[PDB]
Amino acid sequence: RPTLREAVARLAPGTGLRDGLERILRGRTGALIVLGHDENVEAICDGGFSLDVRYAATRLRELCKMDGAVVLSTDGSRIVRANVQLVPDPSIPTDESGTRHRSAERAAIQTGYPVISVSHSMNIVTVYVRGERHVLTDSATILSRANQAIATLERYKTRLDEVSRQLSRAEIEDFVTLRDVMTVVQRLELVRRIGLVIDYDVVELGTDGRQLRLQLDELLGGNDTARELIVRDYHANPEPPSTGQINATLDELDALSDGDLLDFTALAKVFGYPTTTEAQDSTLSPRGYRAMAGIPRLQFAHADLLVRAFGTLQGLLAASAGDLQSVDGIGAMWARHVREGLSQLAEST
Amino acid sequence: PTLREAVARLAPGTGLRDGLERILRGRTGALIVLGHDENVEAICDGGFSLDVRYAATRLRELCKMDGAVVLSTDGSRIVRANVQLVPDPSIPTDESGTRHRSAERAAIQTGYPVISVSHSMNIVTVYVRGERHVLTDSATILSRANQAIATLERYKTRLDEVSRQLSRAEIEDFVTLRDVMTVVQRLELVRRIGLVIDYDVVELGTDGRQLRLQLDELLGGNDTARELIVRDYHANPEPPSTGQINATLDELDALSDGDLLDFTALAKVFGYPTTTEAQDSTLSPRGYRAMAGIPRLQFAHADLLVRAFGTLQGLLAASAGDLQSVDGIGAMWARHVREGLSQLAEST
Amino acid sequence: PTLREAVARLAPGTGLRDGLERILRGRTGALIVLGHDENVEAICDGGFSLDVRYAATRLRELCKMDGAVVLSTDGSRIVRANVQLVPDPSIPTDESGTRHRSAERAAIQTGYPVISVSHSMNIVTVYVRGERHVLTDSATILSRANQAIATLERYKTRLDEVSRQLSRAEIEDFVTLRDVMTVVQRLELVRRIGLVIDYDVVELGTDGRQLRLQLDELLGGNDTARELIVRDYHANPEPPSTGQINATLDELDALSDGDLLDFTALAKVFGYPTTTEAQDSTLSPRGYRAMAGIPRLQFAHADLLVRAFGTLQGLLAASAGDLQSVDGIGAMWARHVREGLSQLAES
Amino acid sequence: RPTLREAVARLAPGTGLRDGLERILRGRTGALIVLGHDENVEAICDGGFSLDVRYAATRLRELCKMDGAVVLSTDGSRIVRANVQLVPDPSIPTDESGTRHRSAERAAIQTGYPVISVSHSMNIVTVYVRGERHVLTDSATILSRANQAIATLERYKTRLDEVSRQLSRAEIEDFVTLRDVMTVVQRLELVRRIGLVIDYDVVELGTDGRQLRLQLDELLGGNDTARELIVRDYHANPEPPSTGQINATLDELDALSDGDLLDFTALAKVFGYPTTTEAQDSTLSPRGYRAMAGIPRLQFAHADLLVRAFGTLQGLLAASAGDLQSVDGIGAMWARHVREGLSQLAEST
Ligand SMILES: Nc1ncnc2c1ncn2[C@@H]1O[C@@H]2COP(=O)(O)O[C@H]3[C@@H](O)[C@H](n4cnc5c(N)ncnc54)O[C@@H]3COP(=O)(O)O[C@H]2[C@H]1O
Ligand SMILES: Nc1ncnc2c1ncn2[C@@H]1O[C@@H]2COP(=O)(O)O[C@H]3[C@@H](O)[C@H](n4cnc5c(N)ncnc54)O[C@@H]3COP(=O)(O)O[C@H]2[C@H]1O
Ligand SMILES: [Cl-]
Ligand SMILES: [Cl-]
Ligand SMILES: [Cl-]
Ligand SMILES: [Cl-]
Ligand SMILES: [Cl-]
Ligand SMILES: [Cl-]
């Protein structure tokens, strides 16, 4: 069945449905619309007339001038019933108020399809999707909220970049501590979560979100890769993290509450380090996956064999060119390319 | 309850504010008592007694009826609806109309907040014991507050610029009253706009959560800066007492916005002459600001050094051994202070 | 009075505007006369005579009634309500309808402002002696003004960049007339946008308080910069007198928007020839702008030094002792100026 | 006869017509207005009053209080009929909804003049011109759309500046590649295209767009010159590109689709380089137009003479003041000026 997020996109600006709903609001008639029709919807439909017409925003507005509910086909392409009386099972729980909205949420739960009720008194559109509710919001209000969020994301992007530069500099110096790594982890997560908030606003804005999508893609882009590499570099298990294990760790980070992300001990637990104060002060050593990823055209197969042999970035830097040609599966030309790239880390700082 | 407390109870994100927004869209009007006891019952006439949990939808429906709705003190319950309030007509009020005059009188007599919604004006007014506040749409508040935050970040840049100028002048040993009062004015301007933004943030409720973090970051350190500059350049010859510092800052707040534009007005608060020649006369900081820049240096240590040497220049000429001669300053701290002072001089 | 004075009297935050806002929400319409004398009484017909203190609520309630409300000149009292205005029909007007045509005719005949509120259009119009102004909701003005602020921030950025280029040229001793006038154009462009936004602040009244803080900070120092550039690059060999400086600034304001794009028109205001060949001729700064760049140096001191040495190059080559034998400059300010100048050259 | 874009201009803010339409919307009367009168319009006109009065916003509002349609003269200066019943040929096809709007578009097609319908229920203005339709939008909504675009244009302008500075660094070092040149070409085009979008909003805004016009011209200022200079520097033709050749290249760039702009090989084709991915790594040598433009006070006329004489930026850097004063039209003063201006770039990067 459609999910709450799917319904929100289907009612977003730029869609045929949203054009009809905008028309209904201006007419102040109210409405009750079922986004789907099957045998289950028929069971709760009572009376009304059957019509078979192509969906049109103008047609929807006219039919919703009538008392009752309008039913659309599942694909949303046709209007099949109008002036219908919904009779959903009263035992289905709902916290809505009044016959119209209580009938709407109950019908949404019983049939499994989205149901829209528009209040003539309040000029509000509500969509019910299987026990969840979404209230449409003015595109101006969403834009104002999203642009402030974009402003916060730009600041999160600036602080992320500088703490990231500090971490890399410490990696060369061999003076990285667990707390420093969790400072970068915290900033990557903060960037990700505010990014998700803006993403939901972009979806809700529909065509009115096109420009916001472009801004969001630049600010975020590369956030997923940075989170994956940092888990790959600083995870407590002696074995280099598997790709699936990395996704498990990242999923644990997402499970943390917004408040927990401010707690460096909680993050330390997600990477397998102890939660103690002393653990934060302890010095770590990067595994080196991030450095290899920066080397152009170096397939991860060659990076995993080298990282497994030497273990740490300092071991990779301490290796000679011949030491990088004595690893099984690494060529002579590849050994030269990796050694030169690590020397460019000296060029970095 | 205070008026600001009442405004918080009606702020966005509360059940009450949800109900009031619904009432406004219904254009029904309302007259709501936020509390119930024997005194309220005395002024209640007719109506229904009911015992239901508060809900925005329930409040909207009940206010469709003529009369008033009374809630429990905690706001969790609706206890009566359709009530006729009859507060003592002798209680004075300058409100207009039966509903609003009855609302303010009821607020005064019972001591609880009373809300009246005008169907004609679509305005929410809350009365708390002779004071009034009219709600403002969150949209207007957000736009107004964002200009204020934008201006405040710019005032914060200007404050940093004049502060570095003062520190450089302090090291150079050529500081004039005018240079100090430029910093005093910028500190106060940041503070006052900060207070303005704070009131809007409170009124915004949940819609002010993001703006609150921005405000706390921009302001942070303003109180310490105001205390320190008073402590360094106050006319009183003995270093200012904690009570004197708090008194001066209260006087600075008492000045009008126009007075903050008058450097002579600021100089009077600091105890200096109001003449124009005073703005040009030189002064010497005590050194509290410099010591505060020293990491890990407890204020108690800085106070002993300032009383011994008297001025920042006396501290800068003091050797590390010379700073182990005052009782209460150890050898390690003495090296740490001299090292810090020499670093401070080079930076300017 | 004037139309601008009336708009101030009707600005947000005033008792009058509060009543008008209440009338607009009530959608009753209104016809209000801001003044009472014999000429008004001649035009008043029927109605009730009352003498009450003005309050926004009182104006709203009285304007629910058909007819017109008359206020005292100072605006402190309501003197008539439900009155019929009967201005001389020979008085010409291009307004539409009985109410608005009666409003303008009454404004012309009596000389006081007259306000009409349209129930159909929910628009407030004030008539002052043959002129018309329509009040605008504070939201619309704020949006209009913020667009102007966006332009102003870009113009301030362009002004800062060209100003730093000019100052760098002053140190290099190779400054041309066209360079100076490039800064002159950008200073004027910033000013003109500033004037437009300032007008929106006035109409906004109390709703413009935040826009005033933002506007004053962005403009801040622009008037001072316009004075300093005139003081540095004005034809007259003697440093321009305060009367000459104000005259130059007044001529710039008189220029049309189109003239500002032409540097030769700007050159004329400063007393230089309009020929393009002149735009390539090198100039010598007096040093007012450079001295203004020195932190903490008040213009009293800066002016004494600039008048003594004559040119910025003379200031740069002066020792600390050379800047102490100018009466009015002590040892401390002479040293501070010497160091401040060396910083500019070194950077 | 009026075209769709021309008609929208006649209804733009600041016009007498748009003032009248704004009055109609506030009055909630609805309207049906024909912008033109000839034999064909009269043919479809039925009943009503014939009047000859000058157009005024107020006069239009009052006349539209009556049932029916108002006809204006072709020049728009007069109101010629009111209370008219339009009877367009019903065979003319239309997909509009309702008697008023379907009658409006049919009349627009049959007579060839613009026709305006105002919905009393929806408070929406639609203009029909020969099978095309446009719905007017409140100036606030257009401004909101345009300010989002201005924000993106601010991000593209910053990104353009940084890659341009990177290209400038490479030009001095003589380590430029096609990929470096095409990164700047792409960023120049993105700024240009978003700028064109904002320009259309300025036109639709009429007088309400004057400030947006000032801001837009400031941000876009210099973008055209940058596009010309980069073509002048890195065009595959051996001789410096011709003026018509430059115009041809920029026209091809405009012809590219948005997706093609994301293809560096697509941009390489326009400049005349090979379309292969390998070609992106080939080294290029700039002619020096861009660097000379960075020199203060240097008129392009003189830079064109120097660039054609020496051929490459590296040749210009190696040139002495005497070498730069042997080009006709380059004096001693300008030879010195360019000589120091180039040696300052060499040191800075
Ligand atoms: N001598 C005349 N010639 C032609 N048409 C006439 C007229 N007198 C009245 N009307 C028409 O009757 C409408 C309603 O007039 P009423 O006196 O009810 O309502 C009036 C009255 O309450 C007030 N108003 C208009 N002119 C006034 C004046 N000179 N003095 C006082 N009140 C005035 O404004 C209301 C609406 O005026 P509006 O012009 O919109 O609407 C006017 C106008 O269209
Ligand atoms: N032949 C027909 N077939 C089916 N339904 C019909 C019809 N003629 C009228 N109606 C219905 O009656 C409504 C009111 O018609 P009325 O002529 O009063 O009000 C009309 C008339 O004043 C004007 N209008 C519509 N078509 C026109 C035309 N061809 N020429 C001139 N005026 C027109 O616009 C008003 C509103 O039009 P709208 O369609 O919204 O509203 C129409 C439409 O819903
Ligand atoms: Cl629509
Ligand atoms: Cl709501
Ligand atoms: Cl009220
Ligand atoms: Cl109000
Ligand atoms: Cl009359
Ligand atoms: Cl329609």
From Swiss-Prot, chain B:
Q: Supply the Pfam families for this chain.
A: DAC, DisA-linker
> What is a single molecular function from GO for this protein?
adenylate cyclase activity
Q: How is its activity regulated?
A: Diadenylate cyclase activity is inhibited by the interaction with RadA.
EC annotation from Swiss-Prot or TrEMBL: 2.7.7.85
Q: How is the cofactor bound?
A: Magnesium. Can also use Mn(2+), and, to a lesser extent, Co(2+). Cannot use Ni(2+), Ca(2+) and Fe(2+).
- Domain named DAC: residues: 1-138
How does the activity vary with pH?
Is more active at pH 8.0 rather than at pH 7.0 or pH 6.0.
> Where on this chain does ATP bind?
67, 85, 98-102
| Keyword vocabulary terms for this entry | ATP-binding, DNA damage, DNA repair, DNA-binding, Magnesium, Manganese, Nucleotide-binding, Nucleotidyltransferase, Transferase
Q: Which GO terms describe its biological process?
A: DNA repair
Q: Which InterPro entries match?
A: DisA (IPR050338), DisA_sf (IPR038331), DNA_integrity_DisA_N_sf (IPR036888), DNA_integrity_scan_DisA_link (IPR018906), DNA_integrity_scan_DisA_N (IPR003390), DNA_integrity_scanning_protein (IPR023763), RuvA_2-like (IPR010994)
Reactions catalysed, as given in the entry: 2 ATP = 3',3'-c-di-AMP + 2 diphosphate
Q: Which domain of life is it from?
A: Bacteria
Q: Does the keyword Disulfide bond apply?
A: no
Statement: the UniProt record of this protein carries the keyword Nucleotidyltransferase: yes
Enzyme type, top EC level: transferase
What this protein needs as a cofactor is: Mg(2+); Mn(2+); Co(2+)
Explain the purpose of this protein: Participates in a DNA-damage check-point. DisA forms globular foci that rapidly scan along the chromosomes searching for lesions. Also has diadenylate cyclase activity, catalyzing the condensation of 2 ATP molecules into cyclic di-AMP (c-di-AMP). c-di-AMP likely acts as a signaling molecule that may couple DNA integrity with a cellular process. To a lesser extent, can also use ADP as substrate to produce c-di-AMP. Does not convert GTP to c-di-GMP. Also exhibits residual ATPase and ADPase activities in vitro.
Give the protein family.
Belongs to the DisA family.
Give the quaternary structure.
Answer: Homooctamer. Interacts with RadA.
**Could you give the domain comment from the record?**
The N-terminal catalytic domain contributes to tetramerization and the C-terminal domain provides additional dimerization. Both domains are required for full catalytic activity. The C-terminal domain may play a role in stabilizing the active conformation.
* Entry protein name: DNA integrity scanning protein DisA
Q: Which organism is it from?
A: Mycobacterium tuberculosis (strain ATCC 25618 / H37Rv)
Q: Which gene encodes it?
A: disA
Curated annotation (Swiss-Prot), chain C:
Q: Where is the DAC domain?
A: 1-138
Binding residue positions for ATP:
67, 85, 98-102
What Pfam family is a match for this entry?
A: DisA-linker
Q: How is the cofactor bound?
A: Magnesium. Can also use Mn(2+), and, to a lesser extent, Co(2+). Cannot use Ni(2+), Ca(2+) and Fe(2+).
Give the required cofactors: Mg(2+); Mn(2+); Co(2+)
Encoding gene, per UniProt annotation: disA
Its name, as the record gives it, is DNA integrity scanning protein DisA
Which NCBIfam families does this UniProt record tie to the protein? PRK13482.1
Q: Which family does it belong to?
A: Belongs to the DisA family.
Its recorded reaction(s) are: 2 ATP = 3',3'-c-di-AMP + 2 diphosphate
Task: Give the top-rank taxon of the lineage listed in the UniProt record for this protein.
Answer: Bacteria
Spell out the molecular function terms from Gene Ontology: adenylate cyclase activity; ATP binding; diadenylate cyclase activity; DNA binding
**EC code(s) of this entry:** 2.7.7.85
Q: What are the leading ranks of the lineage?
A: Bacteria, Bacillati, Actinomycetota, Actinomycetes, Mycobacteriales
Q: Which keywords appear in this protein's UniProt record, sorted alphabetically?
A: ATP-binding, DNA damage, DNA repair, DNA-binding, Magnesium, Manganese, Nucleotide-binding, Nucleotidyltransferase, Transferase
Q: What class of enzyme is it?
A: transferase
The residues forming a coiled coil are: none
Activity versus pH: the note is: Is more active at pH 8.0 rather than at pH 7.0 or pH 6.0.
- What's noted about domains in the record? The N-terminal catalytic domain contributes to tetramerization and the C-terminal domain provides additional dimerization. Both domains are required for full catalytic activity. The C-terminal domain may play a role in stabilizing the active conformation.
PANTHER family cross-referenced by the UniProt entry: DIADENYLATE CYCLASE, DNA INTEGRITY SCANNING PROTEIN DISA
